[PDB]
Amino acid sequence: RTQSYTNSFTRGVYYPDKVFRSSVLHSTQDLFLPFFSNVTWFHAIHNPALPFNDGVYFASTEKSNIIRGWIFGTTLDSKTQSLLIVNNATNVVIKVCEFQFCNDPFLDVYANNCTFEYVSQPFLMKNLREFVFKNIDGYFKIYSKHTPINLERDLPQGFSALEPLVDLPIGINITRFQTLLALHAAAYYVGYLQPRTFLLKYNENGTITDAVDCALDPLSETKC
Amino acid sequence: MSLGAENSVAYSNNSIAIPTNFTISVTTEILPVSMTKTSVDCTMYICGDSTECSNLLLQYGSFCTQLKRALTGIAVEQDKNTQEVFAQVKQIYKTPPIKYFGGFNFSQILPDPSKPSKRSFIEDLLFNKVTLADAGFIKQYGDCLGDIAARDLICAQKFNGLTVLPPLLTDEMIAQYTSALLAGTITSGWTFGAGAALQIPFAMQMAYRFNGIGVTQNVLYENQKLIANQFNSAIGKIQDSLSSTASALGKLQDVVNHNAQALNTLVKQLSSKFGAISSVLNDILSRLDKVEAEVQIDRLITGRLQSLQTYVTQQLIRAAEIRASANLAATKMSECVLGQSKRVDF
Amino acid sequence: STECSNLLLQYGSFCTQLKRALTGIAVEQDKNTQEVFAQVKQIYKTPPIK
Amino acid sequence: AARDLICAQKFNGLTVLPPLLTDEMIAQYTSALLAGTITSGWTFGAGAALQIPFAMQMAYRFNGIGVTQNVLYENQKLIANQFNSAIGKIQDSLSSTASALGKLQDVVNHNAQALNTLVKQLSSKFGAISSVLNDILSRLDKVEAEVQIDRLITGRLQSLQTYVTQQLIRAAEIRASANLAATKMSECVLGQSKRVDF
Amino acid sequence: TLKSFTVEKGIYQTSNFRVQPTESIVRFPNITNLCPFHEVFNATTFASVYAWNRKRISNCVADYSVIYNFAPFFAFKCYGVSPTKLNDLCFTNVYADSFVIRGNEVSQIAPGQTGNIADYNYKLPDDFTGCVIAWNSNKLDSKPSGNYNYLYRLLRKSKLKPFERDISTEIYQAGNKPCNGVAGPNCYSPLQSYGFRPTYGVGHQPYRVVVLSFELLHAPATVCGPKKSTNLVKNKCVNFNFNGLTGTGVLTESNKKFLPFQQFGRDIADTTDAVRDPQTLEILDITPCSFGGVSVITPGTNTSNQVAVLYQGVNCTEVPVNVFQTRAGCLIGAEYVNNSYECDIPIGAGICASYQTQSQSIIAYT
Ligand SMILES: *[C@@H]1O[C@H](CO)[C@@H](O[C@@H]2O[C@H](CO)[C@@H](O)[C@H](O)[C@H]2NC(C)=O)[C@H](O)[C@H]1NC(C)=O
Ligand SMILES: *[C@@H]1O[C@H](CO)[C@@H](O)[C@H](O)[C@H]1NC(C)=O
Ligand SMILES: *[C@@H]1O[C@H](CO)[C@@H](O)[C@H](O)[C@H]1NC(C)=O
Ligand SMILES: *[C@@H]1O[C@H](CO)[C@@H](O)[C@H](O)[C@H]1NC(C)=O
Ligand SMILES: *[C@@H]1O[C@H](CO)[C@@H](O)[C@H](O)[C@H]1NC(C)=O
Ligand SMILES: *[C@@H]1O[C@H](CO)[C@@H](O)[C@H](O)[C@H]1NC(C)=O
Ligand SMILES: *[C@@H]1O[C@H](CO)[C@@H](O)[C@H](O)[C@H]1NC(C)=O
Ligand SMILES: *[C@@H]1O[C@H](CO)[C@@H](O)[C@H](O)[C@H]1NC(C)=O
């Protein structure tokens, strides 16, 4: 695969909890993607495993839904339960099992110590889709957002808050992950979360419209 | 930093410098007098209509009685400060309906009956420049009960037991006292501060004022129009400086700002845990049995009592500073307005 | 100590108002010195003859 | 040598900030005030500095008291010699006795002593098992060390609040004294005062 | 309040009035299933410590008084809650973790502890809420020849994070020479049997442990017990019980825009401002019902016993716990006159009161 490097451009803020707040500035201390970070743009035409380092911000712009899912885990050659995300465009299968994949994961498109199983609404529905995966205290948390962009050249400028979908109490010592591609090509951005303090602004409608990262530059530390 | 421009005065054994002309300069001095009067209910603040918290707070003695006594003393002291500064004149004097005072224009500082609150033009500019922080002297519980847009800070202060009391003298009463002082100063001179007001023409009064500073009174009568024009131009410059620059009243703004900000801090301390398992009293009373919830409630009671004591001590020190400034303002009103002062730089 | 800081964060904003009070005192000291000594517009100089 | 007290205060989180005006700037302001009040009289405090000879300025200051100006001009050597002896006695009084400026020494001494107290309160237990935080952290598990650290946090927070309140009251007293000194500089130096014992 | 039998002339801040609540509302979800604690607490056998069994409990009525009838335990030791209050308030999900340990290690199932079980086998989080139930099972998990069916790990390369499980068995090496799958020198298998015997001491007996971890209410609540719901009334100061959180106030229909994953709404002081009804998806604002301060204006006790009452800061159409409307509240018992005197008893924004002859009476003037 081909790697390029891109600025994050103050992007990747999620709702910290399911509590409505309006017209107030709230300070939180969570695993956030830092502002103006160094995200990695991956073009896939050819796959070593990507490290899972305290949460992953995933961004995609695939219109035709080539991108499908992720293989969070440690071994990824059966032999465990690991974690799996498979979309059938009508359901999501987060069954912690295997499919006997090699080093190149793939998906052909034309139960051995099963601990957890979950079926929900479809996951993957100017088409920038952002996800955040984190693992705290044995809990796997996923945040997501859909945003339309004007021109597809890099990550756009602005604030788009991410909303939670799915909480899972399993996954167990996740340290590597691979992303599914199905061929009957890819332009996906990967960034790494860090423990950071943020100051979030809620407007009168309860929406996060602005944020300050309290460790970027001394002006933002003064603001915090 | 630079201390000032370098100057070397030409001293000699037999050389003197004597002025040949003068200017009449009107300057502005801003003095705080009173601050906001507040009252705190401990049972609404610490407990918030909880019976068990009230029964555990009853064992802590008479802390809240002496907090209420201290805040009531501060609230009485503010009205005493305003009465000591402004209400010194005995009778409400009025100006004659013909506004001729030797060529001096007093229309900027004398009231007009156009607006309901009989204030002058400069008083209107001063009242518009200082932005109040929506104190609770106005009734707002009917407004706080009807939820519109978002929750206000003043509504949270009212719901958490923090109340702002209105002052005794309204704005029109202080304006009427000030207008009486202006009418006495223009018409009678310094004679109204020592007994009955004795009238004198303003040219003769200003000749007395010139004779008080060591200048012979023939200087005024031969330069009356120039002195009147200089006074009118200085009043117009104060008008322009008050209409243009909006950072000269900031000391009074500080008297607003702290008296909001500390109150806001006193609400934010209700969001703290102080070592307990929750900052919500009902969650503590619901999650645990009697002994453990009593321990958590004791931790919360100790923390909130400490924050309230810190607020009362800071208010007492601020009230002492405000009383010192009000005593200075009362002395300046008694010495500069009711007479002529020979104290230099006073 | 990290555990002491994590338990001190539960005590609210006593540190912020203590820091604000000390900052106000430190500003007021310089205001006192300025309002006592800096009373002249120009720095006058005595003549060489004494 | 050994561990100084100021080094312990610096290591425990206590800092002394320098003032905005250096002593050379205060000396320059004082020299400007002296040169103005010697060369020009009281006129430099009311507008432009107007020069006047010193004997004539002193005759004006005698007419300010109630004595006519013929007294000074016929006795000028006597007032000059009396002033020279009186200002020479100030140096002899200040070169021996160290008790006149003790009020200023108090402004030093309290500002040291309270700070020293703020170090000694780090040696108190406040009911815990020890005053050392790392000994509590290593010697106990999570809940018990949380209890002891809460005790120490409450005690040290109370000590720090006591220090800040005492500093606020002393600041109010110092501000009242500074207002008095500013009035004395405005009225005694820049003019002549008729107020008795001022 | 003055602690004396005679009062002087003036205004005295006496008390505070509050409108007392009348009715009580309980709002719980309409869920009818019963939780399967019977297949958790008693079974044929319990799993080992390294493969501890986790069962998810949701969408049912949780009765905790039937737990004592299933197992003969002593200590229903809970950390964030109390065992006698588990029926009133209610949660999102329950998780039951079942295993069998030795009697020395029952103290190791606790937040913030190290050792052998809490370090390498089963680690509880430091902020854990829930209960731990342990009871002796010597009559079910012991054999005279030895019970070798329960396994525990000795040591690991790294520590165990809270709520993780290790299944794979790898031969440990503590030297430069690799084991290469051979348990030779400096190569030890991690898993060892307990070997339970009835002849052993009272501290080495098997103990069945079930850890019930409740996660707190942030999502819509799914699992909680038998509290009868009450019909919802509005525009009245009532005592409400919404999903386990209690309070007193007035519930008003609103126009706040909750996102569909949100349930509550907080305030600057972190108290509940808006709530969502669990039966009908409706957003209600909680406001405290009307309260204020009450001051008493009196002359001296040697003069008379007539008083006037100032209700501070209320537009008094809401008086009970002559009527004159001032800007400092409103006055009951004082007759306003169209005159002007010197101020005797100061009240508020330009209004004072006195005791005058115009039959003696309390009058209020400007
Ligand atoms: C004293 O000063 C005043 C102004 O401070 C002088 O008045 C001005 O005189 C000029 C003529 O040079 C006129 O054009 C202005 O209109 C005057 N101003 C006012 C306000 O009247 C005055 O001439 C000076 N007198 C002497 C003797 O120098
Ligand atoms: C990201 O890291 C790469 C590493 O070589 C560097 O070349 C690039 O400039 C970085 N991007 C930044 C600092 O925006
Ligand atoms: C909140 O949403 C409404 C609904 O469209 C909108 O009219 C209003 O402008 C929004 N408020 C903002 C953007 O502050
Ligand atoms: C007074 O000053 C002048 C000019 O500096 C000088 O010539 C004269 O000698 C001085 N008088 C005395 C007595 O020194
Ligand atoms: C000056 O006085 C006249 C009347 O004598 C008045 O019309 C005018 O408005 C006054 N000037 C100002 C600036 O008010
Ligand atoms: C609970 O009540 C709501 C509204 O009355 C209804 O839509 C829902 O089906 C009910 N739930 C059950 C399990 O009956
Ligand atoms: C628990 O369930 C088993 C399985 O049927 C049964 O044998 C046992 O008696 C039950 N325990 C109790 C206390 O009823
Ligand atoms: C609130 O008080 C004002 C002042 O008299 C009155 O006009 C208004 O009707 C009151 N509001 C009520 C009673 O709801």
Q: E361 by DSSP, 3-state: which?
A: strand
Q: Could you tell me where the DSSP H helices lie in chain B?
A: 42, 51-57, 63-85, 121-129, 141-145, 153-159, 171-187, 202-212, 218-221, 224-244, 250-268, 281-287, 290-332
D92: Cβ contacts below 8 Å, ≥ 6 apart = none
Q: A158: phi > 0 → left, psi -120 to 50 → alpha, else beta; which?
A: left
Chain D residue numbers with beta carbons less than 8 Å from the beta carbon of C25 are 167-168, 171
- Per the CB < 8 Å rule, is C12 touching B310? no
The answer to whether residue B150 neighbours chain A at the CB level (below 8 Å) is: yes
Alpha-carbon distance values, E138 to D76, E116, E144, E206 (Å): 118, 22, 11, 6
| Spatial separation of the C-alpha atoms in residues B220 and E353, rounded to whole Å | 52
Pocket test residue of B12, B13, B15, B16 for ligand 4, highest count of atoms within 8 A of CB: B13
| Spatial separation of the C-alpha atoms in residues E36 and A118, rounded to whole Å | 20
CB E222 within 8 A of CB E243: no
Q: Which two tokens stand for residue A73?
A: 């885990």
Taking every pair of Cα atoms in chain A, the longest distance, rounded to a whole number of angstroms, is 57
Q: Which two tokens stand for residue B53?
A: 């918290």
Q: D73 by DSSP, 3-state: which?
A: helix
| Spatial separation of the C-alpha atoms in residues C25 and C21, rounded to whole Å | 6
Of the partner residues D35, D185, D190, the one whose CB lies closest to the CB of residue C44:
D35
Q: Give bridge partners of residue B315 from the DSSP assignment.
A: none
Give the ligand whose atoms come closest to the C-alpha of residue A3: 2
CB E50 within 8 A of CB E121: yes
Q: Which two tokens stand for residue C45?
A: 């100089």
E169 in contact with ligand 8, CB cutoff 6 A:
no
| Spatial separation of the C-alpha atoms in residues A214 and A197, rounded to whole Å | 6
Burial of D120 (0-12, 13-18, 19+ CB in 10 A): exposed
Q: In what order do the strands lie in the sheet with A139-147?
A: A2-7, A38-43, A187-192, A56-60, A128-136, A139-147, A163-168
| Spatial separation of the C-alpha atoms in residues A81 and E167, rounded to whole Å | 10
Instruction: Tell me the one-letter amino acid at E223.
Output: V
- Per the CB < 8 Å rule, is C47 touching B8? yes
| Spatial separation of the C-alpha atoms in residues B45 and B162, rounded to whole Å | 8
Burial of D115 (0-12, 13-18, 19+ CB in 10 A): middle
- Per the CB < 8 Å rule, is A18 touching E218? yes
CB A191 within 8 A of CB A19: no
Give the ligand whose atoms come closest to the C-alpha of residue B236: 5
Pocket test residue of A20, A23, A205, A210 for ligand 3, highest count of atoms within 8 A of CB: A205
Q: D189 by DSSP, 3-state: which?
A: helix
Q: What is the DSSP string of E185-243?
A: TTEE-SEEE--B-TTS-TTSSEEEEEEEEEEPSSS---B-----------SS-EEEEET
| Spatial separation of the C-alpha atoms in residues E110 and E126, rounded to whole Å | 8
For ligand 6, residues with CB inside 6 Å are E 30, 279-280
Ligand 7: centre distance to CA E43 (Å): 7
CB A139 within 8 A of CB A169: yes
Q: Which of the residues D140, D143, D147 would you substitute to probe the E interface, choosing the one with the greatest number of E C-beta atoms within 10 Å? A: D143
| Spatial separation of the C-alpha atoms in residues B144 and B142, rounded to whole Å | 6
Point out the ligand 6 atom lying closest to the alpha carbon of residue E280: 4
CB E330 within 8 A of CB E324: yes
Q: B326 by DSSP, 3-state: which?
A: helix
B217 in contact with ligand 5, CB cutoff 6 A:
no
Alpha-carbon distance values, D62 to D69, D186, D192, E272 (Å): 6, 20, 10, 78
Q: B157 by DSSP, 3-state: which?
A: helix
| Spatial separation of the C-alpha atoms in residues E25 and A219, rounded to whole Å | 50
Q: Which residue's alpha carbon is nearest to atom 12 within ligand 4? A: B13
Ligand 8: centre distance to CA E315 (Å): 6
The answer to whether residue D15 neighbours chain C at the CB level (below 8 Å) is: no
Q: Which two tokens stand for residue B34?
A: 């009173």
Q: B212 by DSSP, 3-state: which?
A: helix
CB A26 within 8 A of CB A174: no
CB E53 within 8 A of CB E97: yes
Instruction: Quickly count: other Cβ atoms within 10 Å of residue D28's Cβ.
Output: 16
Q: Which residue's alpha carbon is nearest to atom 9 within ligand 5? A: B107
Q: Which residue's alpha carbon is nearest to atom 8 within ligand 8? A: E315
Ligand 6: centre distance to CA E314 (Å): 42
* Method of structure determination: cryo-EM
Chain E interface residues facing chain D, Cβ-Cβ under 8 Å?
111-113, 126
Are chains D and E in contact at 3+ CB pairs closer than 8 Å? yes
CB D14 within 8 A of CB D114: no
A207 in contact with ligand 3, CB cutoff 6 A:
no
Q: Which residue's alpha carbon is nearest to atom 14 within ligand 4? A: B13
Give the count of alpha carbons within 13 A of B202, CB side only: 19
Taking every pair of Cα atoms in chain E, the longest distance, rounded to a whole number of angstroms, is 114
Listed residue (E91, E71, E58) closest to E209, CA to CA: E71
Listed residue (E305, E139, E136, E275) closest to E209, CA to CA: E136
| Spatial separation of the C-alpha atoms in residues D179 and C34, rounded to whole Å | 11
Instruction: Tell me the one-letter amino acid at A153.
Output: R
Q: Dihedral sign for Cα D7, D9, D12, D14, please.
A: negative
Alpha-carbon distance values, D133 to A39, C3, D117, D118 (Å): 41, 10, 19, 17
